[PDB]
């Protein structure tokens, strides 16, 4: 099974530009055999807002707004499933969300649980929890950007049978590409972190989108500044069986009575 990230430079407040860019790159990941393609956090709107008004004005509803319908068009046309970061307008309120779409249309969304830094000024903290989406051929967990920092995010996803963690990101700190292999190891899952690149109103993002294996292998890593795709073949049986030797199964060996809440 093949999974991909799309690393791209969301132009802030310019969604038609970002659609065009994301279409190009999803098609690229598709041509390379990806059945799952993951885009950055807030790929449509960009990231570094000053006011809520400017993002809210343009943010789209899920699933009926322009970002999701665009992604559905693309999924329909390419036959891939897509996990993509999007500013989600929901009534009066904005979420930093990820939509999941497939060739049959809308699959689901995840709202960023752990808001980072100034996101707290613009976005409501996520309220849907950590969800795993069964695509039939695979179960896809989703978390966004800062979620990587809390091992609980990946853990919750993995415990819920995620084969792959899809991880739209707009990373500013340098730690995530290092931590992601450990998240993948400790849960015995695959992770696909799709980072954006670029400078936005003085803020630079890290690039370094990456795919990580359940043995903490980096199967694919992107540049710091270029828009690109990366793909990796993943072996589902490896992640579905949590044994790490004949006498230890990660999930069976967990002893939650001892884990502080």
Summarize the annotated binding site for substrate as residue ranges: 172-173
Asked about 24 being catalytic, the answer comes back as no
Structure tokens at 220: 């694919």
What is the contact surface with Mg ion in residues (CB under 5 A)?
254
- The 8-class DSSP code of residue 91 comes to T
Partner from Br ion, Mg ion, a copy of itself, none binding residue 201, C-beta < 5-8 Å depending on class = none
Partner from Br ion, a copy of itself, Mg ion, none binding residue 241, C-beta < 5-8 Å depending on class = none
Instruction: Look at residue 45 and give its three-state secondary structure.
Output: coil
Q: How far apart are CA 72 and CA 75, in angstroms?
A: 5
CB < 8 Å & 24+ apart, contacts of 157-161? 157/130, 157/132, 157/187, 157/189, 158/187, 158/188, 158/189, 159/187, 159/251, 160/130, 160/131, 160/132, 161/132
Of 239, 172, 162, 168, residue with least CA distance to 210: 168
CB of 121 vs a copy of itself, minimal distance in Å? 9
Nearer to a copy of itself (CB atom), residue 1 or residue 172? 172
CB of 97 vs Br ion, minimal distance in Å? 9
Residues that bind Br ion (CB under 5 A): 14, 16-17, 20-21, 33, 102, 104, 108-109, 131-132, 151-152, 155, 160, 173, 219, 232-233
Residues that bind a copy of itself (CB under 8 A): 113-118, 120, 125-126, 129-130, 146, 149-152, 155-156, 159-160, 175, 178-179, 181-182, 185-186, 216, 245-248, 250, 253-261
């Amino acid at each position: 099974v093949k999974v991909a990230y799309v690393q791209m430079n969301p132009q802030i407040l310019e969604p038609d530009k970002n659609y065009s860019k994301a279409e190009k790159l999803i098609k690229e990941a598709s041509k390379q055999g990806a059945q799952l393609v993951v885009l950055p956090e807030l790929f449509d709107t960009g990231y570094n807002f000053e006011t809520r008004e400017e993002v809210f004005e343009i943010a789209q509803k899920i699933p009926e707004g322009e970002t999701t319908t665009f992604l559905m068009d693309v999924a329909r046309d390419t036959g891939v499933y897509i996990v993509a970061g999007t500013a989600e307008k929901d009534g009066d309120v904005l979420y930093n969300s990820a939509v999941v779409v497939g060739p049959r249309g809308f699959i689901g969304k995840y709202r960023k649980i752990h808001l980072f830094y100034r996101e707290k000024f613009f976005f409501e903290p996520g309220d849907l929890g950590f969800r795993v989406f069964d695509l039939g051929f695979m179960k896809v967990g989703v978390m966004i950007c800062f979620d990587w920092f809390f091992p609980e995010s990946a853990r919750t996803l993995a415990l819920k049978g995620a084969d792959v963690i899809a991880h739209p990101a707009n990373l500013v700190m340098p730690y995530a590409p290092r931590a992601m292999p450990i998240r993948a190891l400790e849960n015995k899952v695959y992770t696909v972190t799709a980072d954006r690149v670029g400078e936005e109103r003085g803020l630079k993002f890290i690039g370094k989108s990456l795919i990580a294996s359940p043995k903490a292998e980096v199967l694919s890593m992107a540049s710091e500044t270029e828009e690109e795709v990366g793909v990796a073949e993943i072996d589902l049986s490896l992640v579905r069986n949590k044994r790490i030797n004949d006498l230890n199964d990660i999930f069976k060996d967990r002893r939650e009575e001892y884990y502080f809440r």
